[PDB]
Amino acid sequence: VVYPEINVKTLSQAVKNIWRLSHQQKSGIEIIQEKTLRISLYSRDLDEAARASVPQLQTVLRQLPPQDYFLTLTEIDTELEDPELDDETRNTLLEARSEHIRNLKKDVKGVIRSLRKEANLMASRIADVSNVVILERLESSLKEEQERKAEIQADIAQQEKNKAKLVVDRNKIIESQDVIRQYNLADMFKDYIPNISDLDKLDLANPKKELIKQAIKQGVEIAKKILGNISKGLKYIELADARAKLDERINQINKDCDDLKIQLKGVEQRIAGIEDVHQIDKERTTLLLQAAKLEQAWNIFAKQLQNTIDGKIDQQDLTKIIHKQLDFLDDLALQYHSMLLS
Ligand code: NA
Ligand code: NA
């Protein structure tokens, strides 16, 4: 027979993590929010049962060794060897050991009921935490939100790119207005913006010619395309009118990007919430492994003492079984005593 190796820190830390996750998680499903609180509540109850079982079973097992029959049965059986008085000594000593054995069975029956009581209790705790169903179509939900996150991020990226193009198209028209305003082109050329050929004839330095000549050509070409002008010349008021439409469209894109960034926080919070629920299931799996080993240990402990008192009573064998079972509990207490959670 071998006892399970149990880490109660891994058990208790997992219960601690379920509590933390069940309260910060914000997937916004609500029934999941309630079910996660059920798991944390029953998880803490399981942890309480595990912590109480150790000093409970220690108390029960420690009552057996100090009994008189452990020592006196060895003294009876050792003196029940040599040629003795067959009635006065031998018959009487047999009836004395039968009295001791009846008390030994009665005590060992009692500690077995205590071990079974802890096993059945831990089994009820394991049932409570495990029976809460949380992963029904949660892999489906995680896929849905990440798909919605993908197209929102894709929309923001396109919107930002379409805005970036409109920003330069706007800035090209602004540069055209600046050279018109700086050199008073509206004063010379009435109503319509001067052509590229007309700008050459102006009294300007050669670097200044190419400066304004490129500005006008670029801003006019853009403005004409926006107003649907593929025929006539461009007026100054039409240049400002062309900019006004771009400012309206850029402002509209900024508003649309703000609404998308609100939705993006929504999906990211819900994906984070779904990931915490997935983590709660993994923390629950971790603690149940340790919890199942406690149930197993007590049922092993019970049947081990049962087999000692089924047939012939090996007084001194039982003393080893108790001390081995006690050393196992001493270890569990050592873990709880020096436990540092986080
Ligand atoms: Na409780
Ligand atoms: Na129940």
Coordinates of C-alpha atoms and ligand atoms in Angstrom, one line a residue:
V1 CA 0.0 0.0 0.0
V2 CA 1.2 3.5 -0.9
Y3 CA -0.3 6.8 0.3
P4 CA -0.9 9.7 -2.2
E5 CA 1.5 12.7 -2.2
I6 CA -0.8 15.7 -1.6
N7 CA 0.2 19.4 -1.8
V8 CA -2.3 21.4 0.2
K9 CA -0.7 24.6 -0.9
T10 CA -1.5 23.9 -4.5
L11 CA -5.1 23.1 -3.3
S12 CA -5.5 26.3 -1.2
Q13 CA -3.8 28.6 -3.6
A14 CA -6.1 27.4 -6.4
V15 CA -9.1 28.2 -4.1
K16 CA -7.6 31.6 -3.5
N17 CA -7.2 32.2 -7.2
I18 CA -10.8 31.2 -7.9
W19 CA -12.0 33.8 -5.4
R20 CA -9.8 36.5 -7.0
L21 CA -10.8 35.6 -10.6
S22 CA -14.5 35.2 -9.8
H23 CA -14.8 38.8 -8.5
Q24 CA -12.6 40.6 -11.1
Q25 CA -14.0 38.7 -14.1
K26 CA -16.4 40.9 -16.2
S27 CA -17.6 38.8 -19.2
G28 CA -21.1 40.3 -18.7
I29 CA -23.0 37.0 -19.1
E30 CA -24.5 37.2 -15.6
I31 CA -25.5 33.5 -15.2
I32 CA -21.7 32.7 -15.6
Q33 CA -21.0 35.5 -13.0
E34 CA -23.4 33.7 -10.6
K35 CA -22.0 30.2 -11.3
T36 CA -18.4 31.4 -10.8
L37 CA -19.4 32.7 -7.4
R38 CA -20.9 29.3 -6.6
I39 CA -17.6 27.6 -7.5
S40 CA -15.6 30.0 -5.3
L41 CA -18.0 29.6 -2.4
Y42 CA -18.0 25.8 -2.6
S43 CA -14.2 25.9 -3.2
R44 CA -13.7 27.7 0.1
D45 CA -16.0 25.2 1.8
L46 CA -13.8 22.3 0.4
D47 CA -10.7 24.1 1.6
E48 CA -12.3 24.5 5.1
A49 CA -13.1 20.7 5.1
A50 CA -9.5 19.9 4.1
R51 CA -8.0 22.1 6.8
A52 CA -10.3 20.7 9.5
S53 CA -9.8 17.1 8.6
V54 CA -6.1 17.0 9.5
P55 CA -6.4 18.0 13.2
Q56 CA -9.6 16.1 13.5
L57 CA -8.1 12.8 12.3
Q58 CA -4.9 13.4 14.3
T59 CA -7.0 13.7 17.5
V60 CA -8.8 10.4 16.7
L61 CA -5.7 8.4 15.8
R62 CA -3.7 9.7 18.8
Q63 CA -6.3 8.3 21.3
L64 CA -5.3 4.6 20.4
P65 CA -1.5 4.4 21.2
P66 CA -1.8 5.4 24.9
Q67 CA -4.3 2.5 25.6
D68 CA -3.2 -0.3 27.9
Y69 CA -3.9 -3.2 25.6
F70 CA -1.1 -2.4 23.1
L71 CA 1.6 -3.2 25.7
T72 CA -0.1 -5.8 27.8
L73 CA -1.1 -7.9 24.8
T74 CA 2.6 -8.4 23.9
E75 CA 3.2 -9.2 27.5
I76 CA 0.3 -11.7 27.5
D77 CA 1.4 -13.4 24.2
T78 CA 5.1 -13.6 25.3
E79 CA 4.1 -15.2 28.7
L80 CA 1.7 -17.5 26.8
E81 CA 4.5 -19.7 25.6
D82 CA 6.3 -21.8 28.3
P83 CA 4.8 -24.8 30.1
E84 CA 2.2 -23.2 32.4
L85 CA -0.9 -23.9 34.5
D86 CA -3.4 -25.0 31.8
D87 CA -6.4 -23.6 33.7
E88 CA -5.3 -21.1 36.3
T89 CA -2.9 -19.2 34.0
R90 CA -3.5 -20.2 30.3
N91 CA -7.3 -20.2 30.3
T92 CA -7.5 -17.0 32.3
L93 CA -4.9 -15.1 30.2
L94 CA -6.8 -16.1 27.0
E95 CA -10.0 -14.5 28.5
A96 CA -8.0 -11.4 29.4
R97 CA -6.7 -11.0 25.8
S98 CA -10.2 -11.6 24.4
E99 CA -11.3 -8.6 26.6
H100 CA -8.4 -6.5 25.3
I101 CA -9.1 -7.5 21.7
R102 CA -12.8 -6.6 22.0
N103 CA -11.8 -3.1 23.2
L104 CA -9.2 -2.8 20.4
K105 CA -11.8 -3.7 17.7
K106 CA -14.3 -1.3 19.2
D107 CA -11.7 1.6 19.1
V108 CA -10.4 0.8 15.6
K109 CA -14.1 0.6 14.4
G110 CA -14.5 4.1 15.8
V111 CA -11.5 5.7 14.0
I112 CA -12.6 4.0 10.7
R113 CA -16.0 5.7 11.1
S114 CA -14.1 9.0 11.6
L115 CA -12.0 8.4 8.5
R116 CA -15.1 7.4 6.4
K117 CA -16.9 10.5 7.8
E118 CA -14.1 12.7 6.4
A119 CA -14.0 10.8 3.1
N120 CA -17.8 11.2 2.6
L121 CA -17.5 14.9 3.5
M122 CA -14.7 15.6 1.1
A123 CA -16.6 13.7 -1.6
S124 CA -19.7 15.9 -1.0
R125 CA -17.4 19.0 -1.3
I126 CA -15.9 17.6 -4.6
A127 CA -19.4 17.1 -6.0
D128 CA -20.5 20.6 -5.1
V129 CA -17.6 22.4 -6.9
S130 CA -17.4 20.1 -9.9
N131 CA -21.2 20.0 -10.7
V132 CA -21.3 23.7 -11.6
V133 CA -21.2 23.8 -15.4
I134 CA -19.4 26.9 -16.8
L135 CA -17.7 25.8 -20.1
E136 CA -20.9 25.2 -22.2
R137 CA -20.4 27.0 -25.5
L138 CA -17.7 29.3 -23.9
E139 CA -15.2 28.3 -26.6
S140 CA -17.9 29.3 -29.0
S141 CA -18.3 32.7 -27.2
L142 CA -14.5 33.3 -27.1
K143 CA -14.5 32.7 -30.9
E144 CA -17.4 35.1 -31.5
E145 CA -15.8 38.0 -29.5
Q146 CA -12.4 37.5 -31.1
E147 CA -14.0 37.6 -34.5
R148 CA -15.9 40.8 -33.5
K149 CA -12.5 42.1 -32.2
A150 CA -10.8 41.3 -35.5
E151 CA -13.3 43.2 -37.7
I152 CA -13.4 46.2 -35.2
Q153 CA -9.6 46.4 -35.3
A154 CA -9.8 46.1 -39.1
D155 CA -12.4 48.9 -39.3
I156 CA -10.3 51.2 -37.1
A157 CA -7.3 50.5 -39.3
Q158 CA -9.1 51.2 -42.5
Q159 CA -10.7 54.3 -41.1
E160 CA -7.3 55.6 -39.8
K161 CA -5.9 55.0 -43.3
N162 CA -8.7 56.8 -45.1
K163 CA -8.4 59.7 -42.7
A164 CA -4.6 59.9 -43.3
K165 CA -5.2 60.3 -47.0
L166 CA -7.9 63.0 -46.4
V167 CA -5.5 64.8 -44.1
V168 CA -2.8 65.3 -46.8
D169 CA -5.5 66.1 -49.4
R170 CA -6.7 68.8 -47.0
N171 CA -3.2 70.0 -46.3
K172 CA -2.5 70.3 -50.0
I173 CA -5.5 72.7 -50.4
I174 CA -4.3 74.6 -47.3
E175 CA -0.9 75.2 -48.9
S176 CA -2.7 76.4 -52.1
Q177 CA -4.7 78.9 -50.1
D178 CA -1.5 80.1 -48.3
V179 CA 0.4 80.9 -51.5
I180 CA -2.8 82.6 -52.9
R181 CA -3.2 84.6 -49.7
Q182 CA 0.5 85.4 -49.4
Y183 CA 1.0 86.7 -52.9
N184 CA -2.5 88.2 -53.3
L185 CA -3.5 86.1 -56.3
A186 CA -7.2 86.9 -55.8
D187 CA -6.4 90.6 -56.2
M188 CA -4.8 90.0 -59.7
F189 CA -6.9 87.2 -61.1
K190 CA -10.6 87.8 -60.5
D191 CA -12.8 84.9 -59.3
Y192 CA -10.8 82.0 -60.8
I193 CA -7.5 80.6 -59.6
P194 CA -4.6 81.4 -62.0
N195 CA -3.5 78.6 -64.3
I196 CA 0.0 77.0 -64.1
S197 CA 1.1 79.0 -67.2
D198 CA 0.0 82.4 -65.8
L199 CA 2.2 82.0 -62.7
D200 CA 5.4 81.9 -64.8
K201 CA 4.8 85.5 -66.1
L202 CA 4.8 86.9 -62.5
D203 CA 7.8 89.0 -61.2
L204 CA 9.1 86.4 -58.8
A205 CA 12.5 84.7 -58.0
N206 CA 12.8 81.4 -59.8
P207 CA 12.8 79.3 -56.6
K208 CA 9.6 81.1 -55.6
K209 CA 7.9 80.4 -58.9
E210 CA 8.3 76.6 -58.6
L211 CA 7.2 76.9 -54.9
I212 CA 3.8 78.4 -55.6
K213 CA 3.4 76.7 -59.0
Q214 CA 3.5 73.3 -57.4
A215 CA 1.2 74.4 -54.5
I216 CA -1.5 75.7 -56.8
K217 CA -1.4 72.7 -59.2
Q218 CA -1.7 70.2 -56.4
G219 CA -4.5 71.8 -54.4
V220 CA -6.5 72.7 -57.5
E221 CA -6.3 69.1 -58.9
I222 CA -7.6 67.7 -55.6
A223 CA -10.3 70.3 -55.1
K224 CA -11.6 69.8 -58.6
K225 CA -11.8 66.0 -58.1
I226 CA -13.8 66.5 -54.9
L227 CA -16.3 68.9 -56.4
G228 CA -16.7 66.8 -59.6
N229 CA -15.0 69.3 -61.8
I230 CA -13.5 67.8 -65.0
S231 CA -14.2 70.7 -67.3
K232 CA -14.1 74.2 -65.9
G233 CA -11.6 76.3 -63.9
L234 CA -11.7 76.5 -60.1
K235 CA -12.9 79.5 -58.1
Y236 CA -11.3 80.6 -54.8
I237 CA -14.6 80.1 -52.9
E238 CA -14.8 76.6 -54.5
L239 CA -11.3 75.8 -53.1
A240 CA -12.6 76.7 -49.6
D241 CA -15.8 74.8 -50.3
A242 CA -13.7 71.7 -51.3
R243 CA -11.8 71.9 -48.0
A244 CA -15.1 72.2 -46.0
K245 CA -16.2 68.8 -47.4
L246 CA -12.9 67.2 -46.3
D247 CA -13.1 68.7 -42.8
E248 CA -16.6 67.3 -42.6
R249 CA -15.5 63.8 -43.7
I250 CA -12.4 63.8 -41.5
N251 CA -14.5 64.9 -38.5
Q252 CA -17.0 62.1 -39.3
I253 CA -14.2 59.5 -39.4
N254 CA -12.9 60.8 -36.0
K255 CA -16.4 60.3 -34.6
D256 CA -16.7 56.9 -36.1
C257 CA -13.3 55.8 -34.8
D258 CA -14.2 57.0 -31.3
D259 CA -17.4 54.8 -31.4
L260 CA -15.3 51.9 -32.6
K261 CA -12.8 52.4 -29.8
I262 CA -15.6 52.2 -27.3
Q263 CA -16.8 48.9 -28.8
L264 CA -13.1 47.7 -28.8
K265 CA -12.9 48.2 -25.0
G266 CA -16.1 46.2 -24.7
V267 CA -15.0 43.1 -26.6
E268 CA -11.5 43.2 -24.9
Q269 CA -13.1 43.3 -21.5
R270 CA -15.4 40.4 -22.4
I271 CA -12.6 38.4 -23.9
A272 CA -10.7 39.0 -20.6
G273 CA -13.7 37.9 -18.7
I274 CA -14.1 34.7 -20.7
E275 CA -10.4 34.0 -20.2
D276 CA -10.9 34.3 -16.4
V277 CA -13.7 31.8 -16.5
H278 CA -11.5 29.4 -18.5
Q279 CA -8.8 30.0 -15.8
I280 CA -11.4 29.2 -13.0
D281 CA -12.0 25.8 -14.6
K282 CA -8.3 25.1 -14.7
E283 CA -7.9 26.2 -11.1
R284 CA -10.9 24.0 -10.2
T285 CA -9.2 21.1 -11.9
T286 CA -6.0 21.7 -10.0
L287 CA -7.7 21.8 -6.5
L288 CA -9.9 18.8 -7.3
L289 CA -6.8 16.6 -8.0
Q290 CA -5.5 17.5 -4.5
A291 CA -9.0 17.1 -3.1
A292 CA -9.5 13.7 -4.6
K293 CA -6.2 12.5 -3.1
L294 CA -7.5 13.5 0.4
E295 CA -10.7 11.4 -0.1
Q296 CA -8.5 8.6 -1.4
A297 CA -6.1 8.8 1.5
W298 CA -8.9 8.5 4.1
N299 CA -10.5 5.6 2.4
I300 CA -7.1 3.9 2.1
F301 CA -6.5 4.7 5.8
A302 CA -9.9 3.1 6.7
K303 CA -9.6 -0.1 4.7
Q304 CA -6.0 -0.5 6.0
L305 CA -7.2 -0.5 9.6
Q306 CA -10.2 -2.7 8.6
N307 CA -7.9 -5.5 7.2
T308 CA -6.0 -5.4 10.5
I309 CA -9.1 -6.3 12.5
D310 CA -10.9 -8.5 10.0
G311 CA -8.8 -11.6 10.8
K312 CA -6.3 -12.2 13.6
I313 CA -5.2 -9.1 15.5
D314 CA -1.5 -8.3 15.0
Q315 CA -1.3 -5.8 17.9
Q316 CA 2.2 -4.6 16.9
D317 CA 1.4 -4.3 13.2
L318 CA -1.5 -1.9 14.0
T319 CA 1.0 0.3 16.0
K320 CA 3.0 0.7 12.7
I321 CA -0.1 1.5 10.7
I322 CA -1.2 4.2 13.1
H323 CA 2.3 5.8 13.2
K324 CA 2.5 5.7 9.4
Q325 CA -0.9 7.3 9.2
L326 CA 0.0 9.8 11.8
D327 CA 3.3 10.8 10.1
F328 CA 1.2 11.4 6.9
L329 CA -1.0 13.8 8.9
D330 CA 2.0 15.4 10.6
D331 CA 3.2 16.2 7.0
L332 CA -0.1 17.8 6.1
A333 CA -0.1 19.9 9.2
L334 CA 3.5 20.9 8.4
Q335 CA 2.3 22.2 5.0
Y336 CA -0.6 24.2 6.5
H337 CA 1.6 25.6 9.3
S338 CA 4.3 27.0 6.9
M339 CA 1.9 28.0 4.1
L340 CA 2.5 31.3 2.3
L341 CA -0.2 32.1 -0.2
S342 CA -0.4 35.0 -2.7
Ligands
NA1 NA -18.9 27.6 5.2
NA2 NA -25.8 20.5 -2.8

